């Protein structure tokens, strides 16, 4: 069902990312005259398995999920083709502080809202996705800084977003990841920044330690600061059963987003783009 | 396999439009907690309506309205799509109290995106068999980016009431004229038969100092494109590829920030 795209239609390949599951490059489609992204997934048994995996992802169609435009089924080369997200990843927005000295709260909360809507959609699919690897690197930002999430199985097929019960390989995985991401969005800090050995992070986390919550990490002027802190701490609870559903997150978040007028979101985006021009 | 959506999942229906093809309402999806739009359209007809909609499911592109699912009820068929908060191109062009200004950069962006969207549909394998492009089914998202839902007779080429592959460019030429003029094509003519007859004899919306002011950017190129697009002879009409070639230079003359300023100024004035 998912359209096949001849590799010969793609030109001007440029590196975007290099992960374990595959390389991602931007490319220009000859016929469509737009940019796309292609993930180069690093035998007939493998080809059959890779098509089935990608056709599962084809079911996901929602405004906050990265659209898959087709598959490159080449002889030596398998590739997933998606929309190109001009503004890159949430990780880049949060941590590139020369480029983005300020990120206005309304935009940050819009991002959080859209992430949760996207994951909520994935959780309501029948069946749900079996694999989960939500992180700031696979939350992408379109031309108007709206979210499209690309947390497909592909990552499984960094440990800071992974809940401790997953260290020894539940419907409570994504909310844990989201709580860390929320913390990261509100702080613009690296989770566990002091700790440099990932194994030390894993040990600490397994014993109930989490990214730091205080007046320094999470500024006083966070809207609904105390409710957000409460949401974060519930989301990354040691006990998976204590963690809220994404439904419950959305219920908590919708009030917060009502405090911003629609025009302030656009002003936040335009101020991002203006400052970035220097 | 286009997803089925139980009708009971949609709530708080509000009227958006009433056409011959069906009623369209906004609704809230209970599980997804977002706004959607639903078009309220025998087993032979139900199967044919599903087949038609599953063909549209293949089309995935930024400038094409996504179909999210089908309401497959016994007595009720319904297509569900994303909700487009800013409605149709027709509303933007013609509601001049609401929208006294629509800055040129925004108008050209709309034209560019329409052409990219139709170009996409024309490159599908196979291409779409049915064609009904009009300002009413060109929709505008929250930041006034286009999504076309082309899955009135002023957009119809003369050979329709006397070619298959030259229909959309004819409609696009009229739409282009309408975007640049903000006038109703054939506004003076009140009998639809007179429009059809006039068009069949080679008459078109008027091109002069009144319809298309001298201050339109790239006025000469745009007029050239319009007149080629609605040529009497279907063979003389350009491909959408050729439109895109002509348009890309024009769109390069605007900085990306001017588009956003145009949208914000639209929303401010609208208050
Ligand atoms: C260099 C330009 N930079 C500057 C800041 C901006 C543009 O950067 C990105 C655009 C992307 N567009 C779409 N997809 C991406 N990734 C991806 C693709 C997938 O399939 C194909 C899957 Cl399955 C998953 C992902 Cl995450 C993107 C990643 C990007 O930068 C990391
Ligand atoms: C001025 C009114 N305001 C606020 C109330 C702007 C909102 O207006 C609209 C939003 C729409 N959102 C999505 N789809 C539409 N239409 C449509 C849907 C289809 O299936 C579901 C098909 Cl198959 C085709 C179409 Cl055209 C829409 C049409 C609209 O008109 C007014």
Swiss-Prot record, chain B:
Q: How is it modified after translation?
A: Polyubiquitinated via both 'Lys-63'- and 'Met-1'-linked polyubiquitin following recruitment by NOD1 or NOD2, creating docking sites for downstream effectors, triggering activation of the NF-kappa-B and MAP kinases signaling. 'Lys-63'-linked polyubiquitination by XIAP is essential for NOD2 signaling and promotes recruitment of the LUBAC complex. Also polyubiquitinated with 'Lys-63'-linked chains by PELI3, BIRC2/c-IAP1 and BIRC3/c-IAP2. Ubiquitinated on Lys-166 via 'Lys-63'-linked by ITCH. Autophosphorylated. Autophosphorylation is however not essential for NOD2 signaling.
List all membrane-crossing ranges. Answer: none
From which residue to which, out of the full length, is covered? 9 to 314 of 540
Q: Per UniProt, what does mutating residue 39 to A do?
A: Abolishes protein-kinase activity without preventing ability to activate NF-kappa-B downstream of NOD2
Membrane-topology annotation of the record: Peripheral membrane protein
Lineage: superkingdom: Eukaryota
Name of this chain's protein? Receptor-interacting serine/threonine-protein kinase 2
Asked whether the UniProt record includes Cell membrane among its keywords, one would answer yes
Q: Where would I find the Protein kinase domain in this sequence?
A: 10-251
């Amino acid at each position: 069902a998912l359209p096949t795209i001849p590799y010969h239609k793609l030109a001007d390949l440029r590196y975007l990312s290099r992960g374990a599951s595959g390389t991602v490059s931007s490319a220009r489609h000859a016929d469509w005259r737009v940019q796309v992204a292609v993930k180069h997934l690093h035998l007939d048994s493998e080809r059959k398995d890779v098509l089935r995996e990608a056709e599962i992802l084809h079911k996901a169609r929602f405004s906050y999920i990265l659209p898959i435009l087709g598959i490159c089924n080449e002889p030596e080369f398998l590739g997933i083709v998606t929309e190109y997200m001009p503004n890159g990843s949430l990780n880049e927005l949060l941590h590139r502080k020369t480029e983005y000295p300020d990120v206005a709260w309304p935009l940050r909360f819009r991002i959080l809202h859209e992430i949760a809507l996207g994951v909520n959609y994935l959780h309501n699919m029948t069946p749900p996705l079996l694999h989960h690897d939500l992180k700031t690197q696979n939350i992408l930002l379109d031309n108007e800084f709206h979210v499209k999430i690309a947390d497909f199985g592909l990552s499984k097929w960094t440990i800071i977003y992974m809940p401790p019960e997953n260290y020894e390989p539940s419907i409570k995985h994504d909310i844990y990841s989201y709580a860390v991401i929320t913390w990261e969005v509100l702080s613009r800090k690296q989770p566990f920044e002091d700790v440099t050995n990932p194994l030390q992070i894993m040990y600490s986390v397994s014993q109930g330690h989490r990214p730091v919550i205080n007046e320094e990490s999470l500024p006083y002027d966070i809207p609904h600061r105390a409710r957000m802190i409460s949401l974060i701490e519930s989301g990354w609870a040691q006990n998976p059963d204590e963690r809220p559903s994404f439904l419950k997150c959305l219920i908590e978040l919708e009030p917060v987003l009502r405090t911003f007028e629609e025009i302030t979101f656009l002003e936040a985006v335009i101020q991002l783009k203006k400052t970035k021009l220097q």
